Ligand binder design. Structure first.
Ligand SMILES: [Ca+2]
Length: 761
């Protein structure tokens, strides 16, 4: 038992940390639970949460030097600047008391590190600075870490339309799948060539990218009704697919107080729980892609470049002044930030009298990511959960719902822009001809409650029914590849009665529908023309032999899997694109959209002759086979997919510390199966196939028999590299295994390994 003073805490609070590193918080008052959550979040993840706050408020340069000034300036440009009275009330009715309690707990732990420097996290020692104190408003004003779109897509699409002109729609069809597959409409008044991609992306990255330390400066979910489970009770599963790292993106915790009994995960800097259950209802999420960013293009006064044309008048930009403290400079830099009425100015070119601003719904009221969970942490039925989702802001999400009374449900939510006269897939001129007409009420989106089929699966695909009214409202056209959704829907529908173990297995599924679709095309390649010549090549034959007996299961011990991932990521698609498009467009498209390239492979008709399709397939397959042989120890002992596909959890400082320190900061869990397209999403980088993203936190819940719920996180619950909970969960995660999400007192007491005691002072 450890005992600490808790100034600002109302009543004694106790925390039991179980043997997997999950803290279980027992407080005597409602808001004390969040005080304790802040203390414990700081105890485990202080450096991580301090860094998020430091990046969000634009205070990086204060400690990391002049290389960080531009990022600090752009970070402050995308802080919430709106009405704070409305902001506090956007998430439910008591969000301000919650945040204030949470940062009082964080601040108590920060004060403790000042009194007991042995508790100071080692990244602070390494880099020569100290953690800050927090204010409650920090929690809601930081926005730029929320998943969003589609500024980048608008920029890429306009850039393509500019360079390819008459061939634009043809090339953009390969570049990005739309669902529903509309023809994008270049807005009246927009010159696609007046969108400088490099300059705009540089500013957007500076405003939004996570903290970076370069050497130069130094989802699936589903819910199943009791009629279809082995338990007779609902089952709810969720594995978000996000960037991997050490420490992990999300953090598992458990909060108990009068009127509060919620367990699950969220980002460790945010109060409350956004994925999990509260002993009555359960909830999990996957991205739902409402278009929440438009790029606005302005004409500026040649006599006054800080003025832009709006409704026939010259309207002045709002200019604010910021002071940025810089390590090694005695005076703070004085910088300015310009805004139009629509948002922060990203870039200006006074030669062409043009400026560009980001109109981001996530800069409006209520868009602190996941903080709408304030209003459903305590919901006890569907009416309350559906109501809480009315005010859900960011990111756009599918929520699946279940409760211990046997109900199951689904409701997507997120701030939804109404564009009366453009489709949001291109930038618009900002002179008033293109204006958001407000926001949709969430009752305009589809939902389901106890559907007849007894199951619901969501996985980032467009799940708006085409005959539902929302399908015509322009909610969004850019969704993720639907392979995971089609695969999990097959699996769930094919299992009349399933267990928790079945749902855990489905989270670990590694069958790739893109692989199966490509193999199906391969088995029709014609032994004629240029293909017949390649079919006499030994290297081609060895690859054809490897693929001809593979079922598309991307297992870690599969050599055909290694061949396919090399082929499908770094060779095939690029070759198909170059064969189908002129060079300039093909260079911009690169590997293009996987679903759209597969469709071309399956129907090459208007893109290339069938014999050209075969020749490209074999030519790129030969090159992929050569790469596999170069990456294998000998051409007789070929590398398995797991041999290449390494699960390394990278620390933000890995590149600026020595080799011994990098081994302690990074966590290597070895080789793994899967790809971006398998339900067990293990996304990778193309340079060396190392893991970059996928499920870290996973959960499968027995809804009603709560102690039977199963979860994992990776690499661990602790952010302290010296702690065994820094890296103890990665081997469990790597085996597709879970540990119990203990919930009842006896179960929490049974699994407890450490007790922490907080005393008011
Ligand atoms: Ca848009």
């Amino acid at each position: 038992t450890d005992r600490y003073a808790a100034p600002g805490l109302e009543k004694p609070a106790s925390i039991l940390i179980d043997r997997w590193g999950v803290p279980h918080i027992y407080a005597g008052t409602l808001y004390d639970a969040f005080y304790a959550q802040g203390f414990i979040a700081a105890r485990d993840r202080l450096w991580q949460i301090d860094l998020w706050r430091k990046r969000g408020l634009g205070e990086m340069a204060r400690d990391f030097g002049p290389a960080y000034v531009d990022g600090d300036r752009m970070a402050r440009a995308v802080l919430y600047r709106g009405d704070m009275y409305r902001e506090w009330l956007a998430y439910g009715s008591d969000a301000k008391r919650v945040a204030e309690a949470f940062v009082a707990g964080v601040n108590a732990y920060v004060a403790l590190t000042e009194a007991q420097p042995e508790l100071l996290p080692r990244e602070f020692k390494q880099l020569g600075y100290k953690p800050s104190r927090w204010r409650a408003e920090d929690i809601v004003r930081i926005r730029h870490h929320g998943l969003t779109l589609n500024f980048t897509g608008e920029v890429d699409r306009a850039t393509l339309y500019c360079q390819a002109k008459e061939q634009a729609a043809r090339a953009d069809w390969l570049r990005r799948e739309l669902d529903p597959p509309i023809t994008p409409t270049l807005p009246e008044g927009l010159d696609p060539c007046a969108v400088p991609a490099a300059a705009l992306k540089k500013a957007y990255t500076l405003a939004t990218a996570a903290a970076n330390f370069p050497k130069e400066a130094w989802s699936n979910n589903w819910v199943i009704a009791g009629s279809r489970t082995s338990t007779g009770r609902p089952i709810l599963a969720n594995d978000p697919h996000r960037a991997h790292g050490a420490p992990s993106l999300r953090y598992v915790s458990h909060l108990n107080a009068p009127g509060l009994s919620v367990i699950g995960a969220g980002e460790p800097f945010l109060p409350g729980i956004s994925i999990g259950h509260n002993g009555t209802i359960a909830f999990g999420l996957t991205r739902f892609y409402m278009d929440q960013e438009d790029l606005y293009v302005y004409e500026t006064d040649p006599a006054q470049p800080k003025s832009y044309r709006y409704r026939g008048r010259w309207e002045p930009m709002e200019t604010i002044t910021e002071k940025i403290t810089v390590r090694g400079e005695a005076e703070p830099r004085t910088v300015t930030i310009d805004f139009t009425r629509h948002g922060p100015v990203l870039h200006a070119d006074d030669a062409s009298h043009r400026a560009w601003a980001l109109r981001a719904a996530w800069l409006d009221t209520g868009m602190a990511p996941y903080f709408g969970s304030m209003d459903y942490m305590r919901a006890t039925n569907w009416d309350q959960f559906r109501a809480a989702m009315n005010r859900w802001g960011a990111p756009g999400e599918n929520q699946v719902y279940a409760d211990r009374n046997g109900n199951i449900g689904w409701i997507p939510g997120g701030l939804t822009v109404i564009r009366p006269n453009w489709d949001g897939l291109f930038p618009v001129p900002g002179d008033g001809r293109y204006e958001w007409a407000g926001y949709r009420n969430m009752d305009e989106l589809p939902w389901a409650y106890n559907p007849s089929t007894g199951h619901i699966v969501t996985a980032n695909e467009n799940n708006i029914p085409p005959d539902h009214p929302a399908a015509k409202l322009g909610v969004g056209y850019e969704w993720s590849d639907s392979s995971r959704a089609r695969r999990l829907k097959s699996l769930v529908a094919a299992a009349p009665v399933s267990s928790l173990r079945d749902s855990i297995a489905w989270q670990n599924d590694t069958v790739s529908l893109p692989a199966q679709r490509t193999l199906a095309v391969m088995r029709t390649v014609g032994n004629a023309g240029a293909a017949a010549s390649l079919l006499q090549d030994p290297q081609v034959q060895r690859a054809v032999a490897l693929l001809r007996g593979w079922d598309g299961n991307v297992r870690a011990d599969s050599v055909p899997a290694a061949l396919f991932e090399i082929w499908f990521s770094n060779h095939l698609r690029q070759a198909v694109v170059r064969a189908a498009l002129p060079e300039d467009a093909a260079k911009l498209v690169g590997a293009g959209d996987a679903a759209r390239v597969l469709a071309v492979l399956e129907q090459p008709d208007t893109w290339m002759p069938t014999a050209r399709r075969d020749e490209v397939m074999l030519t790129s397959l030969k090159a992929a086979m050569a790469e596999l042989e170069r990456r294998s120890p000998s051409p007789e002992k070929l590398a398995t997919w797991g041999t290449l596909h390494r699960a390394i959890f990278r620390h933000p400082l890995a590149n600026i510390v020595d080799d011994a320190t990098r081994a302690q900061y990074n966590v290597d869990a070895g080789g793994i199966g899967g790809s971006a397209f398998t339900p067990m999403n293990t996304s990778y980088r193309n340079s060396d196939y190392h893991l970059t993203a996928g499920a870290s936190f996973r959960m499968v819940l027995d809804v009603g028999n709560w102690d039977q719920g199963r979860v994992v996180n990776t690499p661990g619950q602790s952010g302290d590299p010296g702690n065994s909970h820094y890296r103890d969960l990665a081997p469990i995660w790597a085996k597709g295994q879970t540990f119990p999400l203990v919930y009842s007192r006896k179960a929490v007491e049974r699994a407890a390994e450490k007790r922490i005691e907080l005393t008011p002072r």
